[PDB]
Design a protein around this ligand. Structure first.
Ligand SMILES: COc1ccc(Br)cc1S(=O)(=O)Nc1cc(Cl)ccc1O
Length: 309
């Protein structure tokens, strides 16, 4: 009498629009505890918003130029941001203040993430390097000469033992965190604009600037699934796994829509309309069927969408 729900499609609908940034939004992320959404922007600001109701909570300031990415610690108490001012900053969310400024990159910092233990941060920069930083001291532990063009994404796996990086040089590389040495290079060679590890730890989801998302088994070098129909030839647009309800892949797009695909069949199951510029970033809530999306400078808003499945 116990049955398994299996949705053909979700029904995400617009619930709230979050206004307040004054330039393009660059990233949105839900806190691990589900309570908050953080956004970053070219306007040099981080904003915090209620994850369930969209209500503005606070602004966090101090970078001297625009910000490309922001990421939460596992306990939801810290943020790290990556800026054009060549630094990362670690923030105490409660106080709103900067704890540490991570100095060492020689050009814009584009991407960042804590490891799950949250004692480390990983960054990637226009300077073509990946850096690994100690949270407690705020100092650089390792500099990896990772790529030969800007680094577009960095992500740790679930125990922090591996980092995956992507670059406009066309490569995805897997690094051993403890030693900094490369375990594998995945290779046409179109620019890779986003990558992250999959929920089961075995795959990487990679976006390339040829309008294509691919799910790769990184150990076998085999592409398992491919998702198309969206537009992505210019911007580094995040992609997500939606793990709370039906199994979906989510991404923004240069045609101003959020795209959602069936993980297994690869068919588009919904397109979310409402933004008025490129949707550069999307995020999926960790426990509820909620999506956040954010757009470039003609729009400058974040939208929260909710589904029943
Ligand atoms: C547990 O893993 C999840 C869970 C949710 C999602 Br959305 C993706 C993954 S996965 O990408 O890591 N594994 C996977 C891949 C395919 Cl192609 C088919 C079925 C799968 O469970």
């Amino acid at each position: 009498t116990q049955s398994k729900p299996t949705p053909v499609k979700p029904n995400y609908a617009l619930k709230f629009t979050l206004a307040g940034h004054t330039k393009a939004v660059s990233s949105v992320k839900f806190s691990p505890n589900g309570e908050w959404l953080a956004s970053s922007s070219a306007d040099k600001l981080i904003k915090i918003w209620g994850a369930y109701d969209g209500k503005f909570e606070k602004t966090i300031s101090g970078h001297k130029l625009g910000i490309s990415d922001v990421a939460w610690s596992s306990d939801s108490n810290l943020l790290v941001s990556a800026s054009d001012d060549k630094t990362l900053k670690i923030w105490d969310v409660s106080s709103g203040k900067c704890l540490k400024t991570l100095k060492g990159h020689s050009n814009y910092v584009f991407c960042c993430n804590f490891n799950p233990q949250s004692n480390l941060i990983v960054s990637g920069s226009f300077d073509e390097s990946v850096r690994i930083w100690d949270v407690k001291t705020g100092k650089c532990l390792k500099t990896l000469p990772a790529h030969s063009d800007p680094v577009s994404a960095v992500h740790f796996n679930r125990d922090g033992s591996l980092i995956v990086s992507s670059s406009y040089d066309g490569l995805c590389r897997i690094w051993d965190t403890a030693s900094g040495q490369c375990l594998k290079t995945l290779i046409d060679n179109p620019p890779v604009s986003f990558v992250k590890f999959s929920p089961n730890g075995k795959y990487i989801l990679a976006a390339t600037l040829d309008n294509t998302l691919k799910l790769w088994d990184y150990s076998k070098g085999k592409c398992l699934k491919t998702y198309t129909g969206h537009k992505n030839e210019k911007y580094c647009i995040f992609a997500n796994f939606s793990v709370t309800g039906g199994k979906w892949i989510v991404s923004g797009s240069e045609d101003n829509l959020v795209y959602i695909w069936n993980l297994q069949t690869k068919e588009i199951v919904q397109k979310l309309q409402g933004h008025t510029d490129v949707v550069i970033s999307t995020a999926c809530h960790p426990t509820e069927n909620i999506i956040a999306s954010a757009a470039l400078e003609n729009d400058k808003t974040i939208k929260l969408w909710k589904s029943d499945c």
